[PDB]
Design an enzyme around this catalytic site. Structure first.
Site, PDB file in Angstrom:
ATOM      1  N   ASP B  25       0.772  -1.216   0.000  1.00  0.00           N
ATOM      2  CA  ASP B  25       0.000   0.000   0.000  1.00  0.00           C
ATOM      3  C   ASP B  25       0.808   1.272   0.000  1.00  0.00           C
ATOM      4  O   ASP B  25       1.255   1.728   1.050  1.00  0.00           O
ATOM      5  CB  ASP B  25      -0.907  -0.020   1.234  1.00  0.00           C
ATOM      6  N   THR B  26       0.901   1.906  -1.162  1.00  0.00           N
ATOM      7  CA  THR B  26       1.634   3.154  -1.296  1.00  0.00           C
ATOM      8  C   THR B  26       0.978   4.293  -0.497  1.00  0.00           C
ATOM      9  O   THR B  26       1.611   5.318  -0.232  1.00  0.00           O
ATOM     10  CB  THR B  26       1.695   3.586  -2.771  1.00  0.00           C
ATOM     11  N   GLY B  27      -0.308   4.152  -0.164  1.00  0.00           N
ATOM     12  CA  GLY B  27      -1.001   5.197   0.582  1.00  0.00           C
ATOM     13  C   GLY B  27      -0.754   5.228   2.085  1.00  0.00           C
ATOM     14  O   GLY B  27      -1.019   6.235   2.740  1.00  0.00           O
TER      15      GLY B  27
HETATM   16  N1  LIG Z   1      -1.999   8.141   7.315  1.00  0.00           N
HETATM   17  C1  LIG Z   1      -1.690   7.247   6.392  1.00  0.00           C
HETATM   18  O1  LIG Z   1      -0.799   7.408   5.603  1.00  0.00           O
HETATM   19  O2  LIG Z   1      -2.306   6.072   6.482  1.00  0.00           O
HETATM   20  C2  LIG Z   1      -3.409   5.757   7.366  1.00  0.00           C
HETATM   21  C3  LIG Z   1      -2.776   5.361   8.712  1.00  0.00           C
HETATM   22  C4  LIG Z   1      -2.280   4.006   8.310  1.00  0.00           C
HETATM   23  C5  LIG Z   1      -1.277   3.270   8.939  1.00  0.00           C
HETATM   24  C6  LIG Z   1      -1.033   1.983   8.493  1.00  0.00           C
HETATM   25  C7  LIG Z   1      -1.762   1.443   7.419  1.00  0.00           C
HETATM   26  C8  LIG Z   1      -2.752   2.195   6.776  1.00  0.00           C
HETATM   27  C9  LIG Z   1      -3.005   3.482   7.228  1.00  0.00           C
HETATM   28  C10 LIG Z   1      -4.056   4.468   6.775  1.00  0.00           C
HETATM   29  C11 LIG Z   1      -4.371   4.542   5.318  1.00  0.00           C
HETATM   30  C12 LIG Z   1      -3.571   4.567   4.274  1.00  0.00           C
HETATM   31  N2  LIG Z   1      -4.255   4.664   2.993  1.00  0.00           N
HETATM   32  C13 LIG Z   1      -5.679   4.817   3.291  1.00  0.00           C
HETATM   33  C14 LIG Z   1      -6.300   6.185   2.936  1.00  0.00           C
HETATM   34  C15 LIG Z   1      -5.745   7.276   3.837  1.00  0.00           C
HETATM   35  C16 LIG Z   1      -4.555   7.886   3.463  1.00  0.00           C
HETATM   36  C17 LIG Z   1      -3.991   8.868   4.214  1.00  0.00           C
HETATM   37  C18 LIG Z   1      -4.594   9.239   5.371  1.00  0.00           C
HETATM   38  C19 LIG Z   1      -5.790   8.634   5.749  1.00  0.00           C
HETATM   39  C20 LIG Z   1      -6.372   7.651   5.001  1.00  0.00           C
HETATM   40  C21 LIG Z   1      -6.484   3.634   2.665  1.00  0.00           C
HETATM   41  C22 LIG Z   1      -5.717   2.259   2.855  1.00  0.00           C
HETATM   42  O3  LIG Z   1      -5.067   2.131   1.577  1.00  0.00           O
HETATM   43  C23 LIG Z   1      -6.680   1.069   3.039  1.00  0.00           C
HETATM   44  C24 LIG Z   1      -6.004  -0.295   3.174  1.00  0.00           C
HETATM   45  C25 LIG Z   1      -7.080  -1.363   3.455  1.00  0.00           C
HETATM   46  C26 LIG Z   1      -7.469  -2.350   2.528  1.00  0.00           C
HETATM   47  C27 LIG Z   1      -8.539  -3.236   2.803  1.00  0.00           C
HETATM   48  C28 LIG Z   1      -9.239  -3.135   4.011  1.00  0.00           C
HETATM   49  C29 LIG Z   1      -8.826  -2.177   4.947  1.00  0.00           C
HETATM   50  C30 LIG Z   1      -7.747  -1.316   4.690  1.00  0.00           C
HETATM   51  N3  LIG Z   1      -7.726   0.953   1.984  1.00  0.00           N
HETATM   52  C31 LIG Z   1      -9.015   1.465   1.982  1.00  0.00           C
HETATM   53  O4  LIG Z   1      -9.487   2.243   2.754  1.00  0.00           O
HETATM   54  O5  LIG Z   1      -9.698   1.002   0.991  1.00  0.00           O
HETATM   55  C32 LIG Z   1     -10.790   1.650   0.403  1.00  0.00           C
HETATM   56  C33 LIG Z   1     -11.168   3.102   0.286  1.00  0.00           C
HETATM   57  C34 LIG Z   1     -11.695   3.088  -1.171  1.00  0.00           C
HETATM   58  O6  LIG Z   1     -11.687   1.694  -1.559  1.00  0.00           O
HETATM   59  C35 LIG Z   1     -11.759   0.888  -0.419  1.00  0.00           C
HETATM   60  C36 LIG Z   1      -5.707   4.643   4.828  1.00  0.00           C
HETATM   61  O7  LIG Z   1      -6.724   4.545   5.472  1.00  0.00           O
END
Ligand SMILES: NC(=O)O[C@@H]1Cc2ccccc2[C@@H]1C1=CN[C@@](Cc2ccccc2)(C[C@H](O)[C@H](Cc2ccccc2)NC(=O)O[C@H]2CCOC2)C1=O
EC number: 3.4.23.16
Lengths: 99, 99
Positions: B25-27
């Site tokens: 997860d690049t996000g």
């Molecule tokens: N702060 C930060 O960088 O990341 C936060 C804190 C953190 C720490 C560790 C791991 C993740 C994160 C969090 C984060 C990063 N990207 C997100 C979005 C984000 C980005 C920056 C800030 C807030 C939210 C989404 C993840 O990729 C998540 C992954 C997932 C997949 C499947 C089930 C649950 C979670 N997928 C998800 O919600 O899927 C969807 C949204 C649309 O399609 C569905 C996310 O929720």
């Protein structure tokens, strides 16, 4: 281009004639943007994240330009922390992970 | 390997002797793994994204193997729905986004 991950993969997207910053998110199946006005009807959609589910509005066939690349697809609008470009749009602009 | 985004980018990781399935997860700034026992001491931390916040235990200097490529860094353990490998470890295995 090739984007390293030492810093957040943020890009500017153009939607509705205006620029916004979005995060390239490979962990997100869908593209979710912060509250804004989009044309046409919307249907409901529940999406699950890290802290649980949220209800968002789904808009189909939306023109969105990402880093100069034009894409036309589904966009979800709701209470997201940041604009998220998910896999549905990453595949359209031919984005891959390499290592 | 070059990973396409038509499907979720899942890979096998090995941590604490056991092999697991994780999502690249690049996000995600950090890395969160589902409830498990890791050695060392931890610090509580709250992480949030879609759906809200969850409390996790933060372990530092953890060794993980991502597709054979060993990486070392901070790993969060908590009630996540899926194991997620974030930027902190992706950079270590030389992962980039290309389009
Ligand atoms: N702060 C930060 O960088 O990341 C936060 C804190 C953190 C720490 C560790 C791991 C993740 C994160 C969090 C984060 C990063 N990207 C997100 C979005 C984000 C980005 C920056 C800030 C807030 C939210 C989404 C993840 O990729 C998540 C992954 C997932 C997949 C499947 C089930 C649950 C979670 N997928 C998800 O919600 O899927 C969807 C949204 C649309 O399609 C569905 C996310 O929720």
């Amino acid at each position: 281009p090739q984007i390293t991950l030492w810093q957040r993969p943020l890009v500017t997207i153009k939607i509705g004639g205006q620029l916004k910053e979005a995060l390239l998110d490979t962990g997100a199946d869908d593209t979710v943007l912060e509250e804004m006005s989009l044309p046409g009807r919307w249907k409901p959609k529940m999406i699950g994240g890290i802290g649980g589910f949220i209800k968002v509005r789904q808009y189909d066939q939306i023109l969105i330009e990402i880093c100069g690349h034009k894409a036309i697809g589904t966009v979800l609008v709701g209470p997201t922390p940041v604009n998220i470009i998910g896999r549905n749009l990453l595949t359209q602009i031919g984005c891959t992970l390499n290592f």
